[PDB]
Amino acid sequence: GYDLSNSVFSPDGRNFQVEYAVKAVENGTTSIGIKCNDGVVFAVEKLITSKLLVPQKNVKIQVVDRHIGCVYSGLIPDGRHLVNRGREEAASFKKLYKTPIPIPAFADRLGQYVQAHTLYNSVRPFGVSTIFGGVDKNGAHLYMLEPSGSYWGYKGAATGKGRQSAKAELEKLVDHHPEGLSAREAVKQAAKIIYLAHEDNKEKDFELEISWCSLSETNGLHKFVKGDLLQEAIDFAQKEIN
């Protein structure tokens, strides 16, 4: 019975409802992030359920303020919620401190909010995991947040179904390029890793989506990868995919 109400600790000290939330997460699309040399890239798998979908429209990545990028996997709506609050939490920081919210700061804000939903049985934890980050006064930052409200900083991160395939690919990158990775490179790379990771869901045609926040490529602001730059990576992935 220890898994019917949220705030309940089981005899082994686990909060089951949280872990179940995690399952909702696993059952979703894959997404990743690659902290690069002076920025971060985000990418996610948009599953095309039907020809009836208007192409490149149901955007899933989201921006917070102007320098933070957010992407998450799971119950989509739960993600949006997490982002709206992010936005309110970021505005509030700016209004009072003038400088846009530092990533470490922002993450913790999102952290504390989610953790709060594992404190009362009147609430269900969040059915999503979020990868987000950006550039600030001192470096790029990439974080991932799980339904327990647990979060940490990453070199690369991914989540959703293609999670393991993706992590594998990321692990390669870290060992092969400890120096860093140009934003351009990381872009294509993410495109790839998503393509690869797509195999754990190898049954439906997909639409890639990438975004980046780079100190030399986008001035520290979060922009979406579109046009020439997007196609380049789509092909770079279609290449090394065989």
Partner: protein, 240 residues
Amino acid sequence: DRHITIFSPEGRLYQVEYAFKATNQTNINSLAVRGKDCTVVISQKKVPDKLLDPTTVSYIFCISRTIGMVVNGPIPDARNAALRAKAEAAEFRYKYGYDMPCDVLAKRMANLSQIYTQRAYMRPLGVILTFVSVDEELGPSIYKTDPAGYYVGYKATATGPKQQEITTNLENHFKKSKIDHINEESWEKVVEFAITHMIDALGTEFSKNDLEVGVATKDKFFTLSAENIEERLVAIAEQD
């Protein structure tokens, strides 16, 4: 009777008990000791996945200029306690005109936990907090609190799965020395002692990226960096 913090027929609070187990979920061990004029807390640092940014993994926190706190328990619950410990410490200063003392801060935190213990809607937090500092009145200090709302001060202490072994080791030292503190003038050595006696009890050698040290002296608390630790680790590889 086993879902909310009410009493069980034997007069027990199960949810409180299970929260004590979650404190071990992380599998980290830590210890704190007091020097002549400082305080050290070592905690193992364990970074599994290679994709993690090692620098962001810590269970040791800077609560205020003078108070450092180490947590044994899951991170969410841990950070929750931190923020509050931080907030409270500040408020205390604004309203009373001097920095919140570590013990007072521990007591305050303990009282807050007790409430989760007594009200059904609040789940306890699965974490244990050791607050260390060199109090302007009391001197080097270590105060630890738990999910039951219990809090108390220690000559030295340890927390983690291998708590019992560490404690005995320390218990022995102080029983041999007769004093309630490491008799060393510089924190460096105390840190050394601390790590030495940690290795001595866990039966494991440590590298620089496997520890986490926090030191507190008169007017400041700081966490050493890998390099700093290394200078320690090196120096110990001479006595042993």
